[PDB]
Symmetry: C3
Subunit: 71 residues, 3 copies
């Protein structure tokens, strides 16, 4: 079960890097919203939020995988 | 350890619910792209908070289970 | 001790997350009252902090899993 745990941790690490990237983009677009809260900008922000939530669920999947292995 | 197995099963069910909400969320996302107007935006925000609430609940169950593995 | 301390960090991070969620939950009810423009923006900003809080909790959770391994 050694390969399993460490392989999932590496994927979990990559998944986390992806989350931080999307969050960076989410904070960049949030500053646009401030300068001028248009309605098309709001649309774009919503899309990235769903991407973040997608990435988040994906991370939690890998986490659950690792918890199975640990048990 | 019975609790661990039980929590994993619970953690598993929470995940399935997340994907269901995620699909729902992904549907409505291409329903404001057709009608970029107000209160359809509100419909999505409702589902986003729902997704997040489900996400936090999933993380609560997850940490609870990690306290057990220790 | 890693495990014990990481688990404590996880507890605090989770608390932080649940708190922001309570705020987000209230902001949503305010939106069911009067959808506005400033109101909507106010909800998006809270949603981002929640995601930030969630990513932070997931990072701390991963470290707790590292220790367990």
């Amino acid at each position: 079960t050694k390969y399993k745990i460490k392989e999932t941790l590496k994927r979990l690490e990559d998944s986390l890097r992806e989350l931080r990237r999307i969050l960076e983009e989410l904070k960049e677009m949030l500053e646009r919203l401030e300068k001028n809260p248009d309605k098309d900008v709001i649309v774009e922000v919503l899309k990235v939020i769903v991407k973040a939530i997608e990435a988040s669920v994906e991370n939690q999947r890998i986490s659950a995988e690792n918890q199975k292995a640990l048990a």
